[model samples]
Target: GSDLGKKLLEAARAGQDDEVRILLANGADVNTADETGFTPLHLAAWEGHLGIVEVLLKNGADVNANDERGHTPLHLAAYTGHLEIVEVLLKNGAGVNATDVIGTAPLHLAAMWGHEEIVEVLLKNGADARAQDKFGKTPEDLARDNGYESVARLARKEIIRAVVDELKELIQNVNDDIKEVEKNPEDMEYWNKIYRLVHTMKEITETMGFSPVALVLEAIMMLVKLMLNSEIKITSDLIDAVKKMLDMVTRLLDLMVDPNLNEEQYIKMVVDALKILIEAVNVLIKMVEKNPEDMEFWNLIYRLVHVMKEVTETMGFSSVAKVLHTIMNLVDKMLNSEIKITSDLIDKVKKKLDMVTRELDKMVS
Candidate 1:
């Protein structure tokens, strides 16, 4: 294993993951060991290339493959303290109790390196503390060798195991919270909660250096924003545009949620298109707020009356016809400047809103 091993290591290090496929296809031995006997997967996991680690694992890279000195990737990760990478590796079957030359386990590495959190993780993953090395030394012995008596003491404490258990519980809860949107996409309320959760998760996940999950959450948020803002009143043409957007959002979400469904609707084209509905409502709201008496507001009222008429005469969502009829009458009053003007505008808009309230209840009831 000359620079070929280095090339593999460099490819994983540089995150040249696409080229990695080419290299692997050309029979670049994934298990090729470097001078320290670390394999390509070890280097990738050490360098925190989770994407590359995934690729390597799928390509049959062994997580427990030892280095020349018998130190597994787990040993180096524990010492250098790659906590998130440790979790990923362990989930992929990296051994926590793996011992190196001189009987040095991941516990020894974590204690010697003073990585308290990593020690906690290793212990949780079943690292043995009392296992003596060839030198008759354990992790505490390694800590003492490094002059880290405090760490040595803490490493052997029963409370250390309790701390790991508590962290495990916390991680489980966070993992569950993070999975809600993945499981409950149909619940619109779940969408709202998960949108915020992903927002927060994006910051922490990316900071924790899990770029893939962050990217997925970012995509999910873009689509969820569209779904949450899907409600708005519009004219018939606008309704067509709105429906088109709804269809596209559904298609995009379907792809996001179902990884196995690979049909491309070229959804990346229209993420921002769904935003137009909100823009329309925003402009309408601003016009109504800024120039309540402007001809533009009355014109909008006029167009909506036309929409109501079309819906009744053409589309026929019949249950709403009664309420739409009342709305048309109010639009006529507002449009003709026959407001009768003594808090009459307030009374009329309120009555229009009340009619909508009743219609919604009647439709449901």
Candidate 2:
């Protein structure tokens, strides 16, 4: 059985697709590694044997099986610039960011060799462009050193996208805290929670070199601090402002990750719309504060939210549109007296609207 495994490795490395299949059919272990810890898949990938790679994978080869130097099949395929093999391995569950013994990920190997397409594919598959080797050199550094400026640029974009991905989750946490604070405006603990989450996001963006995002978070932190000190009243407007800031962060991140959107034009539209919507929210907030029982103002607010939802949906902002839809429903309930208008309801609407406004402002800036 062991001998058959060795023969399978040999056949795969030699690109003998039929022999490899035969060996696999003859009970050769698909995951058997040679003396150097190279499995048949690794050999097939390193040797550019796409057929053998597929056959081995189909026969249950370990896609992520590492060698003596901790090089996964992806590392070898990337290093060799075998684009098809890399794709096949990745599609078969090969780890895009798998690191070698020297702490070098497949992205490092692809970037180091100046395999532009492979680097792009690796990044698209979620390779860590900021991964540092044992020498503390990132894929970007290696690509730059090798005079692969374009590859370095690709790596930089991947790093930004990765950071933005992380920021999305952090922002979600902050949004959760914002909701909690809206429920209990007097709860100092919820304020503290948002403060901590925003602070961490700020630190991450700043450290990761996204000054724009960091600046927004810094502004939010300042607002939270003011609220904590009771210098700024914890009204519906203030809570809405904070939520808007978070929406801005989310929009910015979305734009950064997706290149299909025209940044300048989209930002302009969002900003212009937000400028209009903020005034509407301000008017609604004042009206609600003056008389929660005023049916006329509730109807006006409902129209504003309805138009805002249609606009956001047209602009391809489904998330913001969804929030607007919820607010519209809430306003509808208030108008029908199905749910009595209260300070709590007003705050919730303000928070949601503020989230939309801030998101637009952030997009503009």
Candidate 3:
């Protein structure tokens, strides 16, 4: 019994440290799995044989070696709840997030069995507890079901972490007109200028077939109609809200046309970015959401998006006070050229849009 069979079994049982060292030194595969797929290194690691484990690993043992059941060393450590073993395995570049035959990862096993220490360690090492198995049970899904409060809390915190800061900015932009500009809120010039901007946006969106942008424009047109409703005295917050909506809309549109971005990955990036915008606008709708109240909020929203105003101004699209008159220096000589169809205006606008698009790509991407 003390022949090769007994020696191999004994070597794997954490039996004789000296014999295990000898076998490993004699070129036994450190990564060799047995009948049940237990490697000699797995047993030593589970038993906290740090020295033997280190030696085997250095001798080219797979840190992420899997058993016949597809269990990685991390899975073994997590299952046994051996903190030192887990730490050692992780330090040796173990697949900290590996899943097993059942589609349950080390983190999943920890959460399923309520192994708090193992779960926390896995999370800190970047294990996404929110990840799901084949049955679609994320770590949080498992945590809540098993009544693990601390695990649930950790999972929730990661899930609710801040994504973007666009909500406050949108609210602020809408209210800027009232806060930053003249006392008369319903001024024709402001309303007409706002319409011109909206009209340009409508034309651009229609040409580009951007439906989300069209939706935003429809909402803005509603607000513009409110301003044109023969109401001489308009409230500050009402105008501010519309402006904020536009700020949100315009930023979203500019981001769409930006050629430098990987549009496929950034697919619906703006809409997703503005879950906060919807929330802010929903609230603003109830609190001075309409156009008949005095508000300091308008000026507040304007300063928030003062940068965006610079973007439009940079495009030279802002002719001010309701006009899109592209100042034409008509060259009679060029007009009567040999080319019957090409106009200098088309070249100029394309160049200008291209340059602006380049700037937008650099800033955003």
Candidate 4:
């Protein structure tokens, strides 16, 4: 098998796709790596041979398999500026943010070599812009030092995309906090957590030209501030405000990728899912009110949010799905928490549920 593996590696490196296929069909291991930890996929990707890369993947080559130095096929492909090979590796689960031994990711390689197209693809696919190599240089830093200003700028664009996903994640977590705040409005921890998250989001997004997102986050922060300071009673309006902000985040993500992408049809799908989500929330509210300590209710809330998250993901509202998924995770944590679940906690959860349902109705109208 090792001999056959060696032959496959050689064939892949030589760009002899037909020979590589024949060897693999005859029991050669697709994962065969040499002394340098180069597998058939790595060699094929490094050499910019799409055909061999495809053959290797079809034969079950590990796209994320790293070499001796921790470089995956994606790292090699990006370094070589092979666009098609990079795309294929990514499609097969190669990590865009996968780091090598030196903390250099595929994005760093792409930027260093002035591969702007690859840099963009990596960024859009969720590569980190803040990753610094062992030398303490970010990808953009490498690009600039090498006189690849366009690539350097491409790296900068990833900062906003990175924030987009992260801000959505934080919003989802804050929404979960909203649920807890409704039950026990005195939990100063949750209130402080929500305040910090929204404030951080506002500070970063303002400079990125996301004035709309920043503004909504600011408004949400003000409401959270009022609740924290006892300036306002705990109500469903706070939850609705949070949901509206989350919806705005979803729209912002959509516009980031495609300014012309129609949301009219998207809203209809969101409306249907909201109906189902509301029904689940209603049932959960009743269960929790009867017995706040009933772990079942919290479990139900987790499942309900998880289901909606999946639905949103399928409908192409990834940002919306991300936040909802985060909410599900927090609900799971609440179920397992050592702290007691009091009537006050259940009451707050109910209020948030009502607010969510009401905000969603506004979307349909």
Candidate 5:
């Protein structure tokens, strides 16, 4: 049976797709490793044989199964810059940050070989850009030494991308907390959770070399503290820094797709969005106050919030989008007369409107 497994390895290495399938069908051990600890899946991945790789995975081969050196199929496919094979391996649950005997990750090998597209894919899949080998060199360092500036940039962007993900997740949690707290103002757990999430985001933004982004988060961190205390309540500024950070991350994350994108142009677009959001908030506040009973006023606010919701969703600002979506629901109900317009109802709507304003302010201020 082991001899048949060895033949499976050989068939995979030779790119014999039919033989590989037949061997697998005949009960070849998909996880069998030879002297070098390389399995049939490993050999097929090393040679960029997508058909054999697919067959092995479909037959229950361990995608993360490493060789003697701890190199997984993903490592080999990424090292060889086999985009389709790497994609397959990743889809099969291969670890992108898997390290070998020398502590070298697949991203490091891709960087050393100047595989920018592969680097982008690895990063998008959450590869660690700061990951080091036994020699204490990061993938970014390796790419720089090899004069692959584009790869180095992609590596650095991986770190930024991770931060973006962390921020987006925390933002979603905090936004949920905000809604829960409004319904149950006595829920101290929700308040405490928001505090921790915002505090962590502030530290990460600062440590990650995003000075402006950190500045924004820091401001919002203060805002969150004040709101939680209730005695020191501030404007809906809680979402301000969070929204700004989202805008910054959304703009930078585009680098993964457009490696040569002009930073200045991107920054301008971000700032333009910021201005529009702020102006709309200004108008919303005045319209609501001046004509609280006016359907036109509520209709305009609904349209404006809807636009921001679309922008946030497009930029992957899930928390902000979700909040805006809920607010839109409230507006819709009010417009449809599903709820009576009373002082208490107006107060509730006002609080949500303030939240929407703060979201835009975070991006602007």
Candidate 6:
């Protein structure tokens, strides 16, 4: 059996397809390896013997069998620039992202040798183009180093796709936490989890240069932190507002990465609206503090709070909107004589205004 295995390896390397078939049929090991761990499949794939490769694979040769250097048959096929062999190995369930001893995937070998077509096939089969080898070089870096600009560009697209996929998964996680919080509005733990997740998403989007998405996530992080710190009551309306903001953020992520759309203009519009709303909120706060006893000023405060509620709701700051809603109700009670205008009432109103001021200050900074 050992003799037949050795003969099989030699025949595979020598491209003697008929002899390889005969050796395999005669009880020879299909996966017999040489001293260097080069099996019949490895040699056949390296030699570009498409027939023997098919035969070995059909005879139950391990598709992902690795040698002494952790090089699978796919690695040699890619390194040798055997396009047909690469296709065959990948089709037979070869590990597209399998790393060798030095953490080098088959895509790295294909890119290093300027095998553009092979790199494309590997990437199409789910190869991680962003995989860093032991030297911390990505497949794109390798392709660029070898002057393969087109291959580098292809790898760059894969890297971006991978990053977007990662972000989407993280967003899904945040959505799951949102669902839990919606079910249990008083669960501070889930709110904290959301804060952490949103913070991470913010950092990732900021690093990826999606400032609009980052800005939205930054707002969510601050709002979650407020909820966690007991600055706002967790209400059903607040949860719905958060859900809408997350949906908008998901859409923003899609628009930010698309080459045909301009997301910055839309984000600029939102920021401008927020600036106006902040100014209105500041004016209302000053009015409340200056003249707590004037009926005319109370009437003006009622209208301003109503407008601020609509604007904050539109801007997806539901917590702030909820506060404004409460203040509006309080002003209504005062105007109708439902509640007496005592010092205690004034203090309560001032305290709510202070909360709004603190929240807005945090947003601005």
Which is the better candidate, 1 or 4, if ranked by lDDT? Answer: 4
Model 1: ten consecutive residues of lowest lDDT: 269-278
- Candidate 4 overall Cα lDDT vs. reference? 0.74
TM-score of each: 0.40, 0.61, 0.47, 0.50, 0.50, 0.62
Per-residue C-alpha lDDT of model 2 across residues 1-365, encoded as one tens digit per residue: 78998888889989898898788888888899888899988888888989888888888888889778898888889999999999898888888877778899998999987999898898788777778999999999999999999888878877887788788888888778877777878898888888898899989987777555665566577668877888656788657756775676677567556553576766664555456455645644764585456575465556556656776787777777787888887877777789766788888777877887776666556
Q: After superposition, how far is residue 212 of candidate 4 from its true place, in Å?
A: 15
* Per-residue alpha-carbon lDDT of candidate 4 for residues 1-365, written as tens digits (9 for 90 to 100): 67888888889999997899799889998888899898888888887889888888888999999888999989999999999899988998889899989999998899998998888898878888888899988888899999998888767666666767777787678778877877886777888898998888888887565644554465556557767888667667546645655665666554454322367755764575466445535644653564456564465466556656666677755555655655565576577785466666656656665665665666467
| Cand. 4 TM to true fold | 0.50
Candidates 2 and 3: which is better by lDDT? Answer: 2
- Per-candidate RMSD vs. true structure? 21.8, 13.4, 19.3, 16.0, 14.6, 12.8
lDDT of 3: 0.57
Q: Tens digit of lDDT per residue, candidate 5, span 1-365?
A: 78898898899999999998888888888888899888888888888888888988999989998777888888888888899989988887889888889999998999998988888898888788878899989898899998999878767766666667776777777777776776786666776787887788778866666543454455445445656777444334434544454454444434323334475556455545545454445534543553467675566566656766776787755666788888889879989999887777667766776676676557545
> Across residues 102-149, which tens digit of lDDT does each residue of candidate 6 receive?
999999999987898998898888788779999999998898998989
State the TM-score for model 5. 0.50
**Best candidate, TM-score-wise?**
6
Error of 2 at 48 (Å): 1.8
Q: List the residue pairs that clash in candidate 1.
A: none
lDDT of 3 at 137: 81
**How accurate locally, in lDDT, is each candidate?**
0.60, 0.78, 0.57, 0.74, 0.73, 0.78
Tens digit of per-residue lDDT, candidate 3, span 91-168: 878887798877888887777667788788888787865566889887767877988877776665554331112323
- Candidate 2 Cα outliers beyond 4 Å, as residue runs: 1-32, 54-60, 124-138, 229-251, 254-365
Q: Which stretches of candidate 4 lie over 4 Å from their true place?
A: 164-365
